Design an enzyme around this catalytic site. Structure first.
Site, PDB file in Angstrom:
ATOM      1  N   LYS A  45      -5.604  -1.565  -8.163  1.00 58.92           N
ATOM      2  CA  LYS A  45      -6.797  -1.212  -8.953  1.00 58.92           C
ATOM      3  C   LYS A  45      -7.426   0.109  -8.521  1.00 58.92           C
ATOM      4  O   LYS A  45      -8.612   0.355  -8.791  1.00 58.92           O
ATOM      5  CB  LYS A  45      -7.852  -2.335  -8.947  1.00 58.92           C
ATOM      6  CG  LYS A  45      -7.321  -3.760  -9.172  1.00 58.92           C
ATOM      7  CD  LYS A  45      -6.205  -3.857 -10.212  1.00 58.92           C
ATOM      8  CE  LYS A  45      -6.739  -3.524 -11.611  1.00 58.92           C
ATOM      9  NZ  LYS A  45      -5.609  -3.505 -12.584  1.00 58.92           N
ATOM     10  N   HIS A 105       2.471  -1.272  -4.245  1.00 54.16           N
ATOM     11  CA  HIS A 105       1.187  -1.566  -3.619  1.00 54.16           C
ATOM     12  C   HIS A 105       1.379  -2.015  -2.174  1.00 54.16           C
ATOM     13  O   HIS A 105       0.450  -2.575  -1.576  1.00 54.16           O
ATOM     14  CB  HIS A 105       0.442  -2.692  -4.338  1.00 54.16           C
ATOM     15  CG  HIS A 105       0.015  -2.362  -5.730  1.00 54.16           C
ATOM     16  ND1 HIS A 105      -0.589  -1.169  -6.070  1.00 54.16           N
ATOM     17  CD2 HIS A 105       0.047  -3.106  -6.859  1.00 54.16           C
ATOM     18  CE1 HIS A 105      -0.894  -1.186  -7.356  1.00 54.16           C
ATOM     19  NE2 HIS A 105      -0.510  -2.347  -7.861  1.00 54.16           N
ATOM     20  N   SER A 135     -12.885  -4.367 -10.168  1.00 53.54           N
ATOM     21  CA  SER A 135     -11.717  -4.204 -11.016  1.00 53.54           C
ATOM     22  C   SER A 135     -10.690  -5.304 -10.743  1.00 53.54           C
ATOM     23  O   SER A 135     -10.068  -5.824 -11.670  1.00 53.54           O
ATOM     24  CB  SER A 135     -11.095  -2.821 -10.800  1.00 53.54           C
ATOM     25  OG  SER A 135      -9.937  -2.661 -11.598  1.00 53.54           O
ATOM     26  N   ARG A 254     -10.194  -1.222 -18.580  1.00 52.74           N
ATOM     27  CA  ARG A 254     -11.432  -1.987 -18.674  1.00 52.74           C
ATOM     28  C   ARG A 254     -12.636  -1.083 -18.934  1.00 52.74           C
ATOM     29  O   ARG A 254     -13.162  -1.057 -20.064  1.00 52.74           O
ATOM     30  CB  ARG A 254     -11.599  -2.857 -17.414  1.00 52.74           C
ATOM     31  CG  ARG A 254     -12.757  -3.839 -17.464  1.00 52.74           C
ATOM     32  CD  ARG A 254     -12.834  -4.652 -16.173  1.00 52.74           C
ATOM     33  NE  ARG A 254     -13.200  -3.786 -15.054  1.00 52.74           N
ATOM     34  CZ  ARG A 254     -14.450  -3.547 -14.657  1.00 52.74           C
ATOM     35  NH1 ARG A 254     -15.483  -4.147 -15.250  1.00 52.74           N
ATOM     36  NH2 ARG A 254     -14.669  -2.715 -13.639  1.00 52.74           N
TER      37      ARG A 254
END
Ligand SMILES: Nc1ncnc2c1ncn2[C@@H]1O[C@H](COP(=O)(O)OS(=O)(=O)O)[C@@H](OP(=O)(O)O)[C@H]1O
Length: 291
Positions: A45, A105, A135, A254
């Site tokens: 995120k 990640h 997030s 978002r």
């Protein structure tokens, strides 16, 4: 009968990962990197998709149509993400021609050692912790591979404890920071990209040793802006099966701002978070902005 979604995480060397990644760990650990791979590395995120789209645009000389050849997650494979019957990041990469753009990640200590041995260029992106946890909460809700996040309050506590997918944000950003001089790492901040995306993309081009015309730079800037990416089915994750990502719960694209934490955190939650944060971060030379 096999339900691959909403399971509890499984630790790999103390780091909670999706059960299906843990199951296939040997495949990830033994990943074969190539000298010209560019690795996009982030804590979840933190700007992964943004920078992935930027890189694919650079590689395609600002050709927006070429960058619609497939979904971002096919164009820039998520290396360690393996889900049986659904996806395998390592297999996708194994069969991809160079130059490959690779998403991960993984924290430093879990990165397949082939990346270090091949001296790969790595772009790391960090984002302020409070914005990350907001997030990540909504992402947990919509992305069904994750365990149920519970209430915001419960999730925030898990995030502070590092009991979330890919482990603690604190260790993740600090260890990558500490590694930045050892290897060819460009360490970027989401907040800088928000404030001056041109400056940041110019840093990326210099790091990549690529020169492009001003017009192409402006094209890349436009097509990687939040409003364009949000409406782009090739970049906005709407091509995912609903069973994997339900955008009606929360869209992947978002808000795309810095400072949404002020809308999510109560004052009490914020005070508790900062007290914890200072302890965990005070010995690091890393500095973040939160708005
Ligand atoms: N172009 C652009 N500009 C600004 N912000 C953007 C952009 N693309 C994605 N985003 C925002 O980044 C958050 C998603 O982070 P990641 O892409 O790292 O998610 S992931 O870990 O790969 O799943 C998520 O942040 P929040 O909006 O705060 O949830 C996205 O909206």
């Amino acid at each position: 009968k096999l339900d691959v979604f909403r399971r509890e995480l499984v630790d790999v060397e103390g780091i909670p990962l999706f059960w299906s990644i843990a199951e296939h760990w040997s495949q990830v650990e033994s990943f074969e990197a190539r000298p010209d791979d560019i690795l996009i590395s982030t804590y979840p995120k933190s700007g992964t998709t943004w920078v992935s789209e930027i890189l694919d645009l650079i590689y395609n000389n600002g050709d927006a149509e070429k960058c619609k050849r497939d979904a971002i997650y096919k164009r820039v494979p998520f290396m360690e993400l393996i889900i049986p019957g659904i996806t395998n990041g390592v297999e996708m990469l194994n069969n991809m021609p160079s130059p490959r753009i690779v998403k991960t990640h993984l924290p430093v200590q879990l990165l397949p050692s082939s990346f270090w041995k091949n001296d790969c260029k790595i772009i790391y992106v960090a984002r302020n912790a409070k914005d990350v946890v907001v997030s990540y909460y909504y992402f947990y809700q919509m992305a069904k591979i994750h365990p149920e996040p519970g209430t915001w309050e419960e999730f925030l506590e898990k995030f502070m404890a590092g009991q979330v997918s890919f482990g603690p944000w604190y260790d993740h950003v600090k260890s990558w920071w500490e590694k930045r001089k050892e290897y060819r790492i460009l360490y970027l901040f989401y907040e800088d990209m928000k404030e001056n995306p041109k400056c940041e993309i110019q840093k990326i081009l210099k790091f990549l040793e690529k020169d492009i015309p001003e017009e192409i730079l402006n094209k890349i800037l436009y097509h990687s802006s939040f409003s364009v990416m949000k409406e782009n089915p090739s970049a906005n994750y709407t091509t995912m099966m609903k069973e994997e990502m339900d955008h009606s719960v929360s869209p992947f694209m978002r808000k795309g701002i810095s400072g949404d934490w002020k809308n999510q955190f109560t004052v009490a939650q914020y005070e508790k978070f900062e007290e914890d944060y200072v302890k965990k971060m005070e010995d690091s030379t890393l500095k973040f902005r939160s708005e």
